């Protein structure tokens, strides 16, 4: 499992998971708060 976690800790896998999390957060934010143009 140590090798599997080390593989999941590589730059492309970490980048994929992080961008998926950030994109999902932004998408859900725009979903529950439609059309935010100002504060």
């Amino acid at each position: 499992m140590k090798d599997f976690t080390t593989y999941l800790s590589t730059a492309p896998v970490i980048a994929t998971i992080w961008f998926t999390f950030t994109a999902g957060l932004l998408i859900e934010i725009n979903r529950y708060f439609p059309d935010p143009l100002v504060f």
Partner: protein
Amino acid sequence: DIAGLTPCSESKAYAKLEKKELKTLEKRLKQYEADSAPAVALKATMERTKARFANYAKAGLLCGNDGLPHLIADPGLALKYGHAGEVFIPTFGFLYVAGYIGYVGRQYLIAVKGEAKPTDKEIIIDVPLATKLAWQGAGWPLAAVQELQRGTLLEKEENITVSPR
């Protein structure tokens, strides 16, 4: 008001634009039934359009002669005529998140720099240390200002490589 613009709550072109969008959506909706998925989707889009226009007019935005809103970038005008939510508050929000990400990355680099093989820590991310620094980066402006006051934020001239001039 500011720069010859009128508020969106009292602009005729703004209302005409809203009526144009609702008209084309309603025209597209008339071709379907009443209890079908495309009709419900179109009604949801129309409700979203109404809420968006109402929220933009409620926010006190300034519209132009085209019926579209305008942003106030001058700090004085924004804080004087109630337009700080357009470009001021989001500016400070981006500054906080930008310095947040920058400080987290800088801390990770400085932490892995003293190890045996920093290149391995760069291609293979150390998730526990990175997560700890990501959670600790909430005090980035305080830590950055304290670093600047101590003189440890910058590197000396003699320790940086330069061209032979």
